[PDB]
Design a protein around this ligand. Structure first.
Ligand code: ABJ
Length: 844
């Protein structure tokens, strides 16, 4: 119909890719996955509660941490309800429901359907949760702030309405006909061959190279390549991995040997390949290069149909248990593998053995695969174990291509509350890049969770859209999933989304136009500032949505530019610092929503780092630590371009240093402390400032050491007026982290002595450090996946191994404590050295 075609034009615009275009396909897996996702979409659409979906309470079952209780010395919580311009203050108990609080207000005012919504924000205190278990309430306690709330009507569930949809035993062999590219690289002519790997879980089941031959624009072989593997032994999800070396890896492509209908892949292929840049998730994709013109191809012919205990000794269990207790980057020896396999049944009793156990399977042998499947049919120990998110992520990584091993991981994710999904969501989305097939249990989990909760849905959208606009390697898969999400999120979220896209479409247009106008020369010129104001005026008239939702903070609705406060910014890239009126008349404050828009950097790395930071704060929350990190908002929108939350009342440490003298890399030990007292109206708030600085300094020193990003120049560390240190700009002699003598002086100490605030700082660092170490396995897997889904060509030992050593694996708590305090001292020894070394470097 002529409306299903319009609705699909809507979808294409939101997605930024056309899921009906079939110019870069060679089978129908993408189409098949669209039909396939209709069922789980519709199952979740129909069973979701209209009321709770529209209002999307943001809630948790975790206990209020000890540090937040201590901010309620009375078992009462002060909440403030509003109308017209009236307001009263109801004393309330933490265990009280929102329901119970209304009837202790309606009675307090009178002796009809209303809900308490947060002032300034699309966010609600509704549902059968104690008010202490709402996230907005926990945020207002953390921040020393009054819980402000209006009284008004539930939003019409009807607005969320969804549009009805109108939906043998021979060896395997491949023929390498030849390769063809129109323009030959650059250097001279070096020789070229084709390497054909049979690959499963990044494990090479078997390998065969063609003969070497001259590297011309056109090279032909006409060779069958016989593999050691039989056809009946190919596991589901095995890739034919075709690669080309000269010298030396220059090109790769992949073909799924078995397809989405379980059929062996037959016949002629001309595959357009990806070029290497100058191990990671890009190397794994079943997508072909869509640039059919510049790119290198390979031609092949497949012509090959179906298919679908007794008790241990003692020191061996010790061996088995030692292997099991060992960390996720510990290489399994052939000895070790056979041990796990032979004693698979005993191994199955330990949910932690699972990664190593399933990575001890010979996936290239059908009878053994089958035994593995019989192993898992009896997974009752697995099904009763508490969710261990780290274990689960290991099974969803690049080392497992079996649908059945991967599905028991997904099954375990099911008991994650929405709160926890939010924390892992970006890496679960990235883990879709390790699925052999487009339709997986992991894709369907994300779809369902997205659809069940607007907050999850929102972020799912932007996280998928981030990959769809930048990764040639996975945009088709991510687009099919995004469409499926969009086809059920509701007409009110589609509207909201459509506006958000329109805004960052316009603003990035402006961002790029301004980069051209002042090249590199560091001055911000008056002429180029003068165009920025013109261009923004223009969009505010007859182009820019009256109001859009802040992608990194979907509660907030931004309204109109404050053109006056906007400015092209003083860096080499030319980011737009932008400020917006809030569109909500009931906002308590009058402050602006600030957003930095910038091209030049890969913001996906920034996203990855920030999200680990959040995870890290949650870990510290499980042990009643609060490190006052400031994991600011940040979303990649396109190629080397995206948005960043502006943090209020913040300045760089560099700036604070350059105000006093503003010199050629000179530095002052005392200026940070003087800046703090200046910004604090009372000595009272100043001690609240030195406090936050001690915690926040400690948070970032630990976090940042663990992730290996601690050696930063001053320009990229900031502080709020009220004491919060935070690192910025993670987009890609030495120091383990930045504890400089100006930081040290705030702590009431000077090069090599002690103080109350520095004793505090040390011991907090130790508490926080060894708290991360309790989740060593989870952090190692996030880091690893981060490196594989987030950066260029990284090392499956070397780069990954950094975090093992940094988390000082396999050490008792006293060695660790020691190691980390030794790092606190390397920073003291060195002082200004590295910081000064940068200005030495700009001439170097
Ligand atoms: C202007 C100052 C140096 N600054 N840089 C910021 C950046 C942080 C992260 C990446 C950037 O490109 C810039 C920043 C912020 N997010 N909030 C407040 N102030 C900020």
């Amino acid at each position: 119909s002529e409306e299903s075609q319009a609705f699909q034009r809507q979808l294409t615009a939101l997605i930024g890719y056309d899921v009906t275009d079939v110019s870069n396909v060679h089978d129908d897996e993408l189409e098949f996955t669209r039909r396939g996702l209709v069922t789980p979409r519709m199952a979740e659409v129909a069973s979701r509660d209209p009321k709770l979906y529209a209002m999307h309470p943001w809630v948790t079952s975790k206990p209020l941490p000890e540090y937040l209780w201590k901010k309620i010395a009375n078992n009462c919580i002060f909440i403030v309800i509003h109308r017209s311009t009236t307001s009263q203050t109801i004393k309330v108990s933490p265990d009280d429901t929102p329901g119970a609080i209304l009837q202790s207000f309606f009675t307090k005012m009178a002796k009809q359907d209303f809900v308490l919504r947060v002032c300034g924000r699309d966010e609600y205190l509704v549902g059968e949760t104690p008010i202490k278990n709402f996230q907005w309430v926990r945020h207002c306690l953390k921040n020393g702030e009054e819980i402000h709330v209006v009284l008004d009507t539930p939003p019409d569930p009807a607005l969320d309405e969804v549009r009805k949809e109108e939906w043998c035993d021979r060896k395997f062999r491949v023929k390498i006909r030849g390769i063809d590219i129109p323009v030959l690289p650059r250097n001279t002519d070096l020789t070229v061959f084709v390497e054909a790997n049979i690959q499963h879980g990044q494990q090479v089941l078997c390998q065969r190279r063609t003969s070497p031959k001259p590297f011309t624009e056109e090279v032909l072989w006409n060779v069958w390549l016989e593999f050691s593997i039989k056809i009946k032994d190919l596991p589901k999800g095995a890739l034919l991995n075709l690669q080309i070396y000269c010298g030396r890896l220059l090109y790769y492509v992949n073909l799924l040997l078995i397809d989405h209908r379980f059929l062996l892949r037959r016949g002629e292929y001309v595959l357009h390949m990806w070029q290497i840049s100058g191990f990671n998730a890009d190397k794994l994709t079943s997508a072909t290069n869509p640039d059919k013109e510049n790119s290198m191809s390979i031609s092949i012919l497949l012509d090959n149909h179906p298919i679908a205990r007794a008790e241990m000794p003692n020191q061996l269990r010790k061996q088995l248990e030692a292997i099991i207790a060992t960390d996720p980057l510990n290489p399994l020896t052939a000895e070790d593998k056979e041990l796990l396999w032979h004693f698979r049944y005993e191994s199955l009793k330990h949910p932690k053995a699972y990664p190593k156990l399933f990575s001890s399977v010979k996936w290239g042998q059908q009878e053994i695969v089958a035994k593995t499947y019989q192993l898992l049919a009896r997974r009752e120990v697995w099904d009763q174990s508490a969710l261990d998110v780290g274990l689960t992520m290991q099974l969803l990584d690049c080392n497992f291509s079996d649908e059945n091993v991967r599905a028991i991981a997904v099954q375990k994710l099911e008991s994650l509350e929405d709160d926890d999904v939010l924390h892992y969501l970006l890496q679960l989305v990235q883990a879709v890049k390790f699925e052999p097939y487009h339709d997986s249990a992991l894709a369907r989990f994300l779809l369902k969770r997205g659809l069940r909760n607007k907050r999850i849905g929102h972020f799912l959208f932007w996280f998928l859209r981030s990959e769809i606009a930048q990764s040639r390697h996975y945009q088709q898969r991510f687009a099919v999933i995004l469409e499926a999400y969009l086809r059920g999120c509701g007409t009110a979220m589609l509207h909201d989304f459509t506006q958000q896209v329109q805004v960052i479409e316009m603003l990035q247009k402006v961002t790029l136009d301004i980069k051209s106008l002042s090249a590199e020369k560091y001055d911000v010129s008056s002429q180029v500032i003068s165009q920025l104001k013109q261009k923004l005026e223009n969009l505010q008239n007859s182009q820019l949505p009256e109001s859009f939702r802040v992608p990194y903070d979907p509660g907030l609705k931004a309204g109109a530019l404050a053109i006056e406060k906007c400015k092209v910014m003083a860096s080499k890239k030319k980011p737009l610092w932008l400020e917006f009126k809030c569109a909500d008349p009931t906002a308590l404050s009058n402050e602006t929503i600030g957003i930095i828009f910038k091209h030049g950097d890969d913001l996906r790395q920034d996203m990855l780092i920030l999200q680990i930071l959040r995870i890290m704060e949650s870990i510290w929350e499980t042990e009643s630590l609060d490190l006052c990190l400031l994991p600011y908002g940040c979303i990649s929108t396109g190629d080397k371009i995206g948005m960043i939350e502006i943090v209020k009342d913040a300045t760089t440490i560099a700036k604070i240093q350059q105000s006093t003298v503003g010199n050629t890399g000179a530095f002052k030990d005392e200026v940070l402390n003087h800046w703090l007292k200046e910004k604090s109206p009372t000595e009272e708030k100043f001690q609240a400032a030195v406090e936050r600085f001690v915690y926040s300094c400690a948070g970032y020193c630990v976090a940042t050491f663990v992730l290996g990003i601690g050696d930063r120049h001053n320009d990229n560390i900031m502080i709020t007026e009220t004491g919060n240190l935070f690192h910025i700009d993670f987009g890609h002699e030495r120091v383990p982290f930045v504890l400089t003598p100006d930081f040290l002086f705030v702590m009431g100490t000077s090069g090599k002595k002690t103080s109350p605030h520095f004793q505090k700082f040390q011991d907090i660092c130790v508490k926080a450090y060894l708290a991360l170490r309790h989740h060593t396995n989870l952090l190692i897997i996030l880091f690893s996946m981060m490196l594989m889904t987030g950066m260029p060509q990284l090392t499956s030992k070397e780069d990954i191994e950094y975090i093992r050593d940094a988390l000082t694996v396999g050490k008792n708590e006293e060695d660790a404590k020691k190691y980390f305090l030794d790092q606190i001292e390397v920073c003291r020894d060195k002082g200004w050295t590295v910081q000064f070394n940068w200005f030495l470097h700009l001439v170097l």
